[PDB]
Amino acid sequence: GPLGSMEDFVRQCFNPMIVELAEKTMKEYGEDLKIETNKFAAICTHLEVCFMYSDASKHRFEIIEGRDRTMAWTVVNSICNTTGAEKPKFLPDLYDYKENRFIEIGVTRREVHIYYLEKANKIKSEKTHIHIFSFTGEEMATKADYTLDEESRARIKTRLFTIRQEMASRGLWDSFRQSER
Ligand SMILES: O=C(COc1ccc(F)cc1)c1ccc(O)c(O)c1O
Ligand SMILES: O=C(COc1ccc(F)cc1)c1ccc(O)c(O)c1O
Ligand SMILES: O=C(COc1ccc(F)cc1)c1ccc(O)c(O)c1O
Ligand SMILES: [Mn+2]
Ligand SMILES: [Mn+2]
């Protein structure tokens, strides 16, 4: 069977705003999407999941991810000043105005409990909430609190399955999956 190009896949199957933000992110961190095309796909996937999570309840969440870094920190600092939330040590992905906390979103094909533990060990807050999605449909979240309802989460998971399925039909999945870390 033909083995497609990952860059072609990303440009065809992700919305143009997502793709532009992903390109800008990669440039900001000094990386060529032409040699790190699996990473380009992972950044787009993660960004899309952040946007879908926010869209599940419009205006409940401020989006942090996808902004250039200096701008992201000014937003985080503003939120902390306004709401009195504790300032995080690493940029998180969202702020939840309802539960009054920052959220870190993970997207993985590794074992979700291990990935969760590595995230929690990395960020070292008892405040920031972590929500992990696997392409298997599995998920794991801080204190078994999943934040959104089952159908919002099912929409995210279905999008992940769709990405996985389209990658596989293009021969792109095996390499993408192996590229993690
Ligand atoms: O981190 C990644 C890929 O991240 C993923 C994250 C979740 C997945 F299911 C698959 C891949 C990555 C891929 C290619 C590369 O060159 C690189 O430097 C990366 O960090
Ligand atoms: O793309 C990301 C996060 O944003 C990034 C932004 C720039 C990079 F060089 C690397 C990652 C990503 C984050 C968590 C995750 O679980 C995942 O699969 C990701 O692709
Ligand atoms: O952006 C990164 C890695 O690069 C960073 C750059 C600055 C930070 F304060 C934190 C991370 C990142 C990796 C995994 C992930 O899930 C995520 O949301 C990220 O932003
Ligand atoms: Mn992030
Ligand atoms: Mn994240």
Short mmCIF file of N, CA and C in Angstrom, two decimals, residues 26-173:
data_model
loop_
_atom_site.label_atom_id
_atom_site.label_comp_id
_atom_site.label_asym_id
_atom_site.label_seq_id
_atom_site.Cartn_x
_atom_site.Cartn_y
_atom_site.Cartn_z
N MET A 26 6.21 25.79 16.43
CA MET A 26 7.41 25.04 16.13
C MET A 26 8.53 26.04 15.84
N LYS A 27 8.20 27.12 15.13
CA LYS A 27 9.20 28.16 14.81
C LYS A 27 9.71 28.84 16.07
N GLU A 28 8.80 29.14 16.98
CA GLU A 28 9.17 29.76 18.24
C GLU A 28 10.16 28.91 19.02
N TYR A 29 10.08 27.58 18.91
CA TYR A 29 10.98 26.73 19.67
C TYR A 29 12.13 26.19 18.81
N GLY A 30 12.32 26.78 17.64
CA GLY A 30 13.49 26.48 16.83
C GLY A 30 13.50 25.07 16.29
N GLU A 31 12.45 24.73 15.54
CA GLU A 31 12.28 23.39 14.98
C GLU A 31 11.69 23.39 13.59
N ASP A 32 12.21 22.49 12.76
CA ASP A 32 11.73 22.40 11.39
C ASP A 32 10.68 21.31 11.31
N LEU A 33 9.46 21.71 10.93
CA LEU A 33 8.34 20.78 10.78
C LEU A 33 8.60 19.80 9.64
N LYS A 34 9.62 20.06 8.83
CA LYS A 34 9.93 19.15 7.73
C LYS A 34 10.79 17.98 8.18
N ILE A 35 11.48 18.11 9.31
CA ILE A 35 12.23 16.99 9.88
C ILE A 35 11.54 16.48 11.16
N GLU A 36 10.52 17.19 11.60
CA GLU A 36 9.89 16.71 12.82
C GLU A 36 8.40 16.66 12.57
N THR A 37 8.03 16.02 11.47
CA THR A 37 6.65 16.05 10.99
C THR A 37 5.72 15.27 11.97
N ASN A 38 6.24 14.23 12.61
CA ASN A 38 5.45 13.51 13.61
C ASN A 38 5.13 14.43 14.79
N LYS A 39 6.10 15.25 15.16
CA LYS A 39 5.86 16.23 16.22
C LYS A 39 4.87 17.29 15.77
N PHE A 40 4.92 17.68 14.49
CA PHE A 40 3.99 18.67 13.95
C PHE A 40 2.57 18.10 14.13
N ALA A 41 2.44 16.80 13.84
CA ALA A 41 1.11 16.15 13.97
C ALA A 41 0.66 16.08 15.43
N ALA A 42 1.57 15.77 16.33
CA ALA A 42 1.25 15.74 17.76
C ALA A 42 0.87 17.09 18.37
N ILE A 43 1.58 18.15 17.99
CA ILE A 43 1.20 19.50 18.40
C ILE A 43 -0.20 19.87 17.88
N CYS A 44 -0.47 19.61 16.61
CA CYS A 44 -1.83 19.89 16.09
C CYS A 44 -2.93 19.12 16.84
N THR A 45 -2.68 17.83 17.06
CA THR A 45 -3.63 16.98 17.82
C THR A 45 -3.88 17.56 19.21
N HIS A 46 -2.80 17.83 19.93
CA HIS A 46 -2.94 18.38 21.29
C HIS A 46 -3.66 19.72 21.29
N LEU A 47 -3.29 20.61 20.37
CA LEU A 47 -3.98 21.90 20.28
C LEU A 47 -5.48 21.71 20.01
N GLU A 48 -5.82 20.82 19.09
CA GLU A 48 -7.21 20.57 18.74
C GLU A 48 -7.98 20.05 19.98
N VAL A 49 -7.34 19.18 20.74
CA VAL A 49 -7.96 18.69 21.97
C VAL A 49 -8.15 19.85 22.97
N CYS A 50 -7.15 20.73 23.11
CA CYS A 50 -7.36 21.88 23.99
C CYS A 50 -8.54 22.73 23.53
N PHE A 51 -8.66 22.94 22.22
CA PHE A 51 -9.77 23.77 21.70
C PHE A 51 -11.13 23.10 21.87
N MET A 52 -11.16 21.80 21.69
CA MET A 52 -12.42 21.07 21.86
C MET A 52 -12.84 21.07 23.32
N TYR A 53 -11.87 20.96 24.21
CA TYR A 53 -12.16 20.93 25.64
C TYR A 53 -12.76 22.28 26.06
N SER A 54 -12.12 23.36 25.61
CA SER A 54 -12.68 24.70 25.85
C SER A 54 -14.08 24.89 25.23
N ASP A 55 -14.24 24.43 24.00
CA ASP A 55 -15.52 24.59 23.32
C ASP A 55 -16.67 23.79 23.90
N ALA A 56 -16.36 22.75 24.67
CA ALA A 56 -17.38 21.97 25.36
C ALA A 56 -18.25 22.83 26.29
N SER A 57 -17.73 23.98 26.71
CA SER A 57 -18.46 24.90 27.57
C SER A 57 -17.94 26.31 27.34
N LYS A 58 -18.50 26.97 26.32
CA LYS A 58 -17.92 28.24 25.86
C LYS A 58 -17.86 29.31 26.95
N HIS A 59 -16.71 29.95 27.03
CA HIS A 59 -16.38 30.93 28.07
C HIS A 59 -16.14 30.46 29.49
N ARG A 60 -16.29 29.18 29.75
CA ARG A 60 -15.87 28.68 31.04
C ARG A 60 -14.34 28.62 31.15
N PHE A 61 -13.66 28.42 30.01
CA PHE A 61 -12.21 28.20 30.02
C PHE A 61 -11.44 29.31 29.30
N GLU A 62 -10.36 29.80 29.91
CA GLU A 62 -9.42 30.63 29.15
C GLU A 62 -8.40 29.67 28.50
N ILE A 63 -8.03 29.89 27.25
CA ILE A 63 -7.02 29.06 26.61
C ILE A 63 -5.65 29.66 26.75
N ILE A 64 -4.69 28.85 27.19
CA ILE A 64 -3.32 29.34 27.40
C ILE A 64 -2.44 28.80 26.26
N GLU A 65 -2.62 27.51 25.95
CA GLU A 65 -1.85 26.82 24.91
C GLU A 65 -2.07 27.48 23.55
N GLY A 66 -1.07 27.45 22.67
CA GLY A 66 -1.26 27.98 21.35
C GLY A 66 -0.88 29.47 21.22
N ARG A 67 -0.75 30.16 22.34
CA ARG A 67 -0.29 31.55 22.35
C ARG A 67 1.23 31.53 22.34
N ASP A 68 1.88 32.59 21.87
CA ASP A 68 3.33 32.65 21.97
C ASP A 68 3.65 32.75 23.46
N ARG A 69 4.86 32.36 23.86
CA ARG A 69 5.15 32.19 25.28
C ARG A 69 5.03 33.44 26.16
N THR A 70 5.55 34.57 25.67
CA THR A 70 5.50 35.80 26.44
C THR A 70 4.02 36.17 26.66
N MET A 71 3.23 36.09 25.59
CA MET A 71 1.80 36.38 25.72
C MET A 71 1.10 35.39 26.68
N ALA A 72 1.45 34.10 26.59
CA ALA A 72 0.86 33.10 27.48
C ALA A 72 1.12 33.43 28.94
N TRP A 73 2.35 33.84 29.26
CA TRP A 73 2.63 34.18 30.65
C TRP A 73 1.91 35.44 31.11
N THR A 74 1.84 36.45 30.24
CA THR A 74 1.04 37.64 30.66
C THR A 74 -0.44 37.27 30.93
N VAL A 75 -1.01 36.40 30.11
CA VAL A 75 -2.36 35.91 30.41
C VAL A 75 -2.47 35.14 31.74
N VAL A 76 -1.56 34.20 31.97
CA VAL A 76 -1.54 33.45 33.23
C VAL A 76 -1.41 34.40 34.46
N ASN A 77 -0.48 35.34 34.37
CA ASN A 77 -0.26 36.36 35.41
C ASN A 77 -1.50 37.20 35.64
N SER A 78 -2.17 37.61 34.56
CA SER A 78 -3.42 38.37 34.71
C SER A 78 -4.47 37.54 35.44
N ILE A 79 -4.63 36.29 35.05
CA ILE A 79 -5.62 35.45 35.69
C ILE A 79 -5.27 35.33 37.18
N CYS A 80 -4.00 35.14 37.49
CA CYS A 80 -3.64 34.93 38.90
C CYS A 80 -3.95 36.20 39.69
N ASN A 81 -3.58 37.34 39.14
CA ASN A 81 -3.90 38.61 39.79
C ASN A 81 -5.39 38.82 40.01
N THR A 82 -6.19 38.56 38.98
CA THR A 82 -7.64 38.71 39.07
C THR A 82 -8.35 37.72 39.98
N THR A 83 -8.05 36.44 39.84
CA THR A 83 -8.79 35.40 40.54
C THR A 83 -8.11 35.02 41.83
N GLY A 84 -6.85 35.42 41.98
CA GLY A 84 -6.05 34.99 43.12
C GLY A 84 -5.60 33.54 43.10
N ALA A 85 -5.80 32.85 41.98
CA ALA A 85 -5.21 31.51 41.78
C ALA A 85 -3.69 31.51 41.98
N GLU A 86 -3.15 30.44 42.54
CA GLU A 86 -1.69 30.36 42.67
C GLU A 86 -1.03 30.28 41.30
N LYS A 87 0.09 30.97 41.14
CA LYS A 87 0.80 30.97 39.87
C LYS A 87 1.48 29.63 39.62
N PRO A 88 1.27 29.03 38.44
CA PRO A 88 1.91 27.73 38.14
C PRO A 88 3.38 27.89 37.73
N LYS A 89 4.17 26.81 37.78
CA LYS A 89 5.61 26.93 37.44
C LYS A 89 5.90 26.66 36.00
N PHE A 90 4.99 25.92 35.35
CA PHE A 90 5.09 25.69 33.92
C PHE A 90 3.77 26.18 33.30
N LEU A 91 3.81 26.65 32.06
CA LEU A 91 2.59 27.10 31.41
C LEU A 91 1.66 25.90 31.27
N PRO A 92 0.43 26.05 31.76
CA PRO A 92 -0.63 25.05 31.64
C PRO A 92 -1.35 25.25 30.32
N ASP A 93 -2.44 24.51 30.08
CA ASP A 93 -3.12 24.58 28.78
C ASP A 93 -4.39 25.45 28.85
N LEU A 94 -5.07 25.38 30.00
CA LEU A 94 -6.36 26.11 30.15
C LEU A 94 -6.48 26.66 31.56
N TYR A 95 -7.36 27.65 31.74
CA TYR A 95 -7.82 28.00 33.09
C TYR A 95 -9.32 27.79 33.16
N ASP A 96 -9.79 27.10 34.21
CA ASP A 96 -11.19 26.75 34.35
C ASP A 96 -11.78 27.80 35.30
N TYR A 97 -12.60 28.69 34.77
CA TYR A 97 -13.13 29.80 35.58
C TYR A 97 -14.18 29.32 36.57
N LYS A 98 -14.78 28.17 36.28
CA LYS A 98 -15.80 27.62 37.16
C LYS A 98 -15.19 26.92 38.37
N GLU A 99 -14.31 25.94 38.14
CA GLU A 99 -13.62 25.27 39.27
C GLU A 99 -12.39 26.05 39.79
N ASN A 100 -12.09 27.21 39.20
CA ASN A 100 -11.04 28.08 39.71
C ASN A 100 -9.64 27.43 39.70
N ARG A 101 -9.28 26.75 38.61
CA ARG A 101 -7.96 26.12 38.55
C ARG A 101 -7.40 26.04 37.13
N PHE A 102 -6.08 26.02 36.98
CA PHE A 102 -5.47 25.73 35.69
C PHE A 102 -5.58 24.22 35.39
N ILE A 103 -5.49 23.87 34.11
CA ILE A 103 -5.65 22.49 33.68
C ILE A 103 -4.50 22.24 32.75
N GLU A 104 -3.87 21.07 32.91
CA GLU A 104 -2.93 20.50 31.95
C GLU A 104 -3.59 19.34 31.19
N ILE A 105 -3.59 19.41 29.85
CA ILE A 105 -4.20 18.38 29.04
C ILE A 105 -3.07 17.52 28.46
N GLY A 106 -3.17 16.20 28.57
CA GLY A 106 -2.16 15.35 27.91
C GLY A 106 -2.80 14.51 26.82
N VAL A 107 -2.09 14.26 25.71
CA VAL A 107 -2.60 13.34 24.68
C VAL A 107 -1.47 12.34 24.47
N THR A 108 -1.78 11.05 24.58
CA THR A 108 -0.70 10.02 24.58
C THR A 108 -1.16 8.73 23.93
N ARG A 109 -0.21 7.88 23.55
CA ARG A 109 -0.55 6.47 23.25
C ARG A 109 0.25 5.57 24.20
N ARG A 110 0.99 6.18 25.12
CA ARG A 110 1.59 5.38 26.21
C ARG A 110 0.51 5.02 27.24
N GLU A 111 0.90 4.21 28.23
CA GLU A 111 -0.03 3.74 29.25
C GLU A 111 -0.46 4.96 30.02
N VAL A 112 -1.77 5.19 30.18
CA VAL A 112 -2.24 6.48 30.70
C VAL A 112 -1.86 6.75 32.14
N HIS A 113 -1.83 5.72 32.99
CA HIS A 113 -1.46 5.92 34.38
C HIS A 113 -0.01 6.34 34.52
N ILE A 114 0.87 5.74 33.73
CA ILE A 114 2.28 6.18 33.78
C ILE A 114 2.40 7.61 33.28
N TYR A 115 1.76 7.90 32.14
CA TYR A 115 1.85 9.24 31.57
C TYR A 115 1.32 10.24 32.60
N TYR A 116 0.21 9.89 33.27
CA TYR A 116 -0.34 10.77 34.29
C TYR A 116 0.70 11.02 35.40
N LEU A 117 1.33 9.96 35.87
CA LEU A 117 2.30 10.12 36.94
C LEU A 117 3.49 10.97 36.52
N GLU A 118 3.95 10.81 35.29
CA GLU A 118 5.05 11.66 34.83
C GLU A 118 4.62 13.13 34.75
N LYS A 119 3.42 13.38 34.25
CA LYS A 119 2.92 14.78 34.23
C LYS A 119 2.84 15.38 35.64
N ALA A 120 2.27 14.62 36.57
CA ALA A 120 2.08 15.10 37.93
C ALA A 120 3.43 15.33 38.59
N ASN A 121 4.41 14.53 38.21
CA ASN A 121 5.70 14.66 38.86
C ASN A 121 6.42 15.85 38.30
N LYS A 122 6.09 16.18 37.05
CA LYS A 122 6.74 17.29 36.38
C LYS A 122 6.25 18.63 36.89
N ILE A 123 4.95 18.77 37.11
CA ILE A 123 4.44 20.13 37.38
C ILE A 123 4.36 20.52 38.87
N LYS A 124 4.26 19.52 39.74
CA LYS A 124 4.48 19.74 41.17
C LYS A 124 3.51 20.72 41.85
N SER A 125 2.32 20.91 41.28
CA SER A 125 1.28 21.67 41.97
C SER A 125 0.24 20.74 42.55
N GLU A 126 -0.36 21.15 43.66
CA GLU A 126 -1.54 20.46 44.16
C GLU A 126 -2.77 21.23 43.69
N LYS A 127 -2.54 22.25 42.86
CA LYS A 127 -3.62 23.07 42.34
C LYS A 127 -4.00 22.70 40.91
N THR A 128 -3.00 22.66 40.01
CA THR A 128 -3.26 22.41 38.58
C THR A 128 -3.86 21.01 38.35
N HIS A 129 -4.97 20.97 37.63
CA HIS A 129 -5.71 19.74 37.40
C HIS A 129 -5.17 19.10 36.12
N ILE A 130 -4.93 17.79 36.13
CA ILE A 130 -4.43 17.13 34.95
C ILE A 130 -5.48 16.22 34.30
N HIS A 131 -5.63 16.30 32.97
CA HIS A 131 -6.62 15.45 32.28
C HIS A 131 -5.87 14.87 31.11
N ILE A 132 -5.71 13.56 31.13
CA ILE A 132 -5.07 12.80 30.06
C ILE A 132 -6.06 12.04 29.19
N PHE A 133 -5.88 12.16 27.87
CA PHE A 133 -6.61 11.37 26.86
C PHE A 133 -5.61 10.46 26.11
N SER A 134 -5.99 9.21 25.96
CA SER A 134 -5.23 8.31 25.09
C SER A 134 -5.97 8.14 23.78
N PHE A 135 -5.24 7.79 22.73
CA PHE A 135 -5.90 7.44 21.50
C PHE A 135 -6.66 6.11 21.66
N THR A 136 -6.43 5.36 22.74
CA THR A 136 -7.25 4.15 22.99
C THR A 136 -8.67 4.49 23.50
N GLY A 137 -8.90 5.74 23.89
CA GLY A 137 -10.20 6.11 24.42
C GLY A 137 -10.08 6.12 25.93
N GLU A 138 -8.95 5.68 26.44
CA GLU A 138 -8.79 5.69 27.90
C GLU A 138 -8.54 7.11 28.37
N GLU A 139 -8.79 7.40 29.64
CA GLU A 139 -8.49 8.74 30.12
C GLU A 139 -8.19 8.65 31.59
N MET A 140 -7.55 9.67 32.14
CA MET A 140 -7.18 9.67 33.55
C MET A 140 -7.16 11.11 33.97
N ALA A 141 -7.70 11.42 35.13
CA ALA A 141 -7.74 12.82 35.54
C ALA A 141 -7.56 12.91 37.04
N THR A 142 -7.05 14.05 37.47
CA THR A 142 -6.78 14.33 38.87
C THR A 142 -8.01 14.09 39.74
N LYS A 143 -7.83 13.24 40.75
CA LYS A 143 -8.85 12.95 41.74
C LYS A 143 -10.11 12.36 41.14
N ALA A 144 -9.98 11.64 40.03
CA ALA A 144 -11.13 11.08 39.31
C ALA A 144 -12.21 12.12 39.02
N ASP A 145 -11.80 13.38 38.89
CA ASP A 145 -12.71 14.44 38.49
C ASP A 145 -12.47 14.80 37.01
N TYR A 146 -13.42 14.44 36.15
CA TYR A 146 -13.23 14.50 34.70
C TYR A 146 -13.67 15.83 34.08
N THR A 147 -14.18 16.73 34.92
CA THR A 147 -14.53 18.10 34.52
C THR A 147 -15.71 18.26 33.57
N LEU A 148 -15.61 17.70 32.37
CA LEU A 148 -16.67 17.75 31.39
C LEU A 148 -17.53 16.51 31.48
N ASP A 149 -18.72 16.58 30.89
CA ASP A 149 -19.62 15.43 30.90
C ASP A 149 -19.25 14.40 29.84
N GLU A 150 -19.90 13.24 29.88
CA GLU A 150 -19.46 12.12 29.06
C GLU A 150 -19.58 12.37 27.60
N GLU A 151 -20.59 13.10 27.16
CA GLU A 151 -20.68 13.28 25.73
C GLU A 151 -19.63 14.28 25.19
N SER A 152 -19.23 15.28 26.00
CA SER A 152 -18.17 16.24 25.56
C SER A 152 -16.86 15.46 25.40
N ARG A 153 -16.58 14.64 26.41
CA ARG A 153 -15.38 13.80 26.37
C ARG A 153 -15.43 12.79 25.26
N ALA A 154 -16.61 12.24 24.99
CA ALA A 154 -16.77 11.29 23.88
C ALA A 154 -16.49 11.93 22.53
N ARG A 155 -16.87 13.20 22.38
CA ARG A 155 -16.53 13.94 21.14
C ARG A 155 -15.01 14.04 20.92
N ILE A 156 -14.31 14.40 22.00
CA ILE A 156 -12.80 14.42 21.96
C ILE A 156 -12.23 13.05 21.61
N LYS A 157 -12.70 12.01 22.29
CA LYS A 157 -12.19 10.67 22.01
C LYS A 157 -12.45 10.17 20.62
N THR A 158 -13.63 10.50 20.09
CA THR A 158 -13.98 10.15 18.74
C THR A 158 -13.08 10.87 17.75
N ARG A 159 -12.77 12.13 18.02
CA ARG A 159 -11.84 12.85 17.13
C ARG A 159 -10.48 12.14 17.16
N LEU A 160 -10.04 11.73 18.34
CA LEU A 160 -8.76 11.01 18.43
C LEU A 160 -8.78 9.70 17.68
N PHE A 161 -9.89 8.96 17.79
CA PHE A 161 -9.97 7.72 17.01
C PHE A 161 -9.93 8.00 15.53
N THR A 162 -10.65 9.03 15.09
CA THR A 162 -10.66 9.40 13.67
C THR A 162 -9.24 9.72 13.15
N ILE A 163 -8.48 10.45 13.94
CA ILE A 163 -7.11 10.80 13.55
C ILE A 163 -6.28 9.55 13.42
N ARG A 164 -6.38 8.70 14.43
CA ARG A 164 -5.66 7.45 14.43
C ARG A 164 -6.02 6.60 13.19
N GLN A 165 -7.31 6.55 12.87
CA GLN A 165 -7.82 5.72 11.76
C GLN A 165 -7.33 6.25 10.41
N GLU A 166 -7.40 7.56 10.24
CA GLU A 166 -6.92 8.16 9.00
C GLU A 166 -5.40 8.04 8.86
N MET A 167 -4.66 8.22 9.96
CA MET A 167 -3.23 7.94 9.93
C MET A 167 -2.95 6.51 9.49
N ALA A 168 -3.68 5.56 10.05
CA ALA A 168 -3.43 4.15 9.77
C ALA A 168 -3.73 3.87 8.31
N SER A 169 -4.77 4.47 7.76
CA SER A 169 -5.09 4.14 6.38
C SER A 169 -4.07 4.77 5.47
N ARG A 170 -3.34 5.77 5.98
CA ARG A 170 -2.25 6.30 5.16
C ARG A 170 -0.88 5.67 5.40
N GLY A 171 -0.80 4.67 6.29
CA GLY A 171 0.47 4.07 6.69
C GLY A 171 1.29 4.93 7.63
N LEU A 172 0.65 5.92 8.26
CA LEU A 172 1.36 6.92 9.07
C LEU A 172 1.34 6.64 10.57
N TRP A 173 0.43 5.76 10.98
CA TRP A 173 0.19 5.54 12.41
C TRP A 173 1.36 4.91 13.12
#
